Amino acid sequence: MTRFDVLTVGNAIVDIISRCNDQFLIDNQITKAAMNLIDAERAELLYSRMGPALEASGGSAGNTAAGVANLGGKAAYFGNVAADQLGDIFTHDIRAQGVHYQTKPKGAFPPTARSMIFVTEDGERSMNTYLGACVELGPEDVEADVVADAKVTYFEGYLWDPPRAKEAILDCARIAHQHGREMSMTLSDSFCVDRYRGEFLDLMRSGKVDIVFANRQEALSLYQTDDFEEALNRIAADCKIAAVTMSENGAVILKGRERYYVNAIRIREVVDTTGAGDLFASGFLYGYTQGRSLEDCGKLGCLAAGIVIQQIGPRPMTSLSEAAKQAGLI
């Protein structure tokens, strides 16, 4: 036995969520469906134009850890907030879900990261992220005992944006692999992939990453191709296990020459896609750490992702474990 099923590492962020029309995105030069990095000045400008909003703890990896705990697995999280109200909210929400979270704030400034997320009528989400305190995450925040005692350590491609987070991840990869654990990453966002293409490919080919999560767009961006079949063949060659999502088209899990196709669950209405990929990872990694088949892992991922897209906010407000039990996935 160990202490954690899944440790995740990411940018600790509080989400500020509002609905908008398509024209708002155009007028403000926000790239639709993407993660748009912004500075403090731009954060003030955008907020000044944003409608009344709702706040909810976010962070891709944070959502994933919360999701694993929700399903009934044991999760931990590394991510850096500030000693401010947003940081206190973030700390509370993740710990209240039963996720181990012990990353200590270093002061009040820069303030806790936030992302202004604009949800259009089609349920698509466009994020505008000021990293704030996230730029302070470094090797000093690695709890070596946690990495050593976690079955999987999972991290965001998004961590390549802040300056020193990657040093923490390399330390994690070493510790995890010396203790016979597995490393996982998500490609995060197609533009993120574009910024760090060579570095991501090296993480996979050097074996620092064992399990890779991607959506169609990210897989296409990784190999700079319009040919999805090429992207699948290439990704299977570069990592031990790849889990590739295709929105309403479900997912495909790849391992060597094996391919496992899973359907998306039936949806009432696409309310807000925020957190879909994160929760697919929750479902998958929970399944994986419970010794379930790759196909069943995919099924648990699709169930979790389908639930989260039918609510506002990135972390399911309902029991995923109960949903799994009812769906016959247990």
Place this chain on the structure above:
Amino acid sequence: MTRFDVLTVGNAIVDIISRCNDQFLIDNQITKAAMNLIDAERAELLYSRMGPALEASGGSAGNTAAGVANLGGKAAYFGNVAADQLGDIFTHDIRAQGVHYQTKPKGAFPPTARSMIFVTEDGERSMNTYLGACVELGPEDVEADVVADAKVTYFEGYLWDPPRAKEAILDCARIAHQHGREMSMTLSDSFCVDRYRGEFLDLMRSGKVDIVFANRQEALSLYQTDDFEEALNRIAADCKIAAVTMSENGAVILKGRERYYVNAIRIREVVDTTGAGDLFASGFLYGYTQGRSLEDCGKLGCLAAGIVIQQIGPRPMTSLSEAAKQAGLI
């Protein structure tokens, strides 16, 4: 040609919202369906026990102002926040709805008020409010020109808990009445009524308040009776216009010997009752300041209340003006 239809005055609060079971309330000695005042230590304690949460700008009168603006009316708000992130959230949300909000924070401590709101399976809401910076609201926060130029100034019975807010209200009553405007209050909460019964009756009988809002429980509390018919007779005698809500049983508007009953809208499913009374007042006061019949004011109130209880959070995220137009209430 005046500047505002409705000025509201209340405790400026950010809500921290979570689901719980009935037993959570019993175990923590939280009075179900009530506003429970709490100190800083208890706020820390309750939060430590609360599950993952959502944040949304609240404050009864704040919600009411936002509602009036959403309907298409001209609103203003007085309420005191701190110079902190919660205060920034509050300031943004109310101003973004198009409500005039210019109350200046006085510093960072006490911090901005928050209410931990626990929603049970039945959709009932139990609030646990730390007043924080609200204790600093006083006469110095009265924008005299705003009161003078508002058709109605509406305020919370809740304002009787902090120490100096009542002085600001008396000042408002003088300015409003000297400029031929009307004053309105909500009785807020049945326990609040119990704390300030004599004072509230005085506000009505002295004519400092022209229009009173109440639910069944508050009206019963005000006259310390189990007889609702007696409560209706007495309240009609004590104020010029009374608007009494009865949840699923609709509302009754009283003026002298006149009574106007209004049906409640048929709900799909009650999600969260937070804000129902606040938005009834939005609808009523929007109608009233547009010169609409008392019945039509009640209709607009019930419409707004019906919408807000079908969502999480106290301020409708959908267009009330569009809903009113579709309803022929225009």
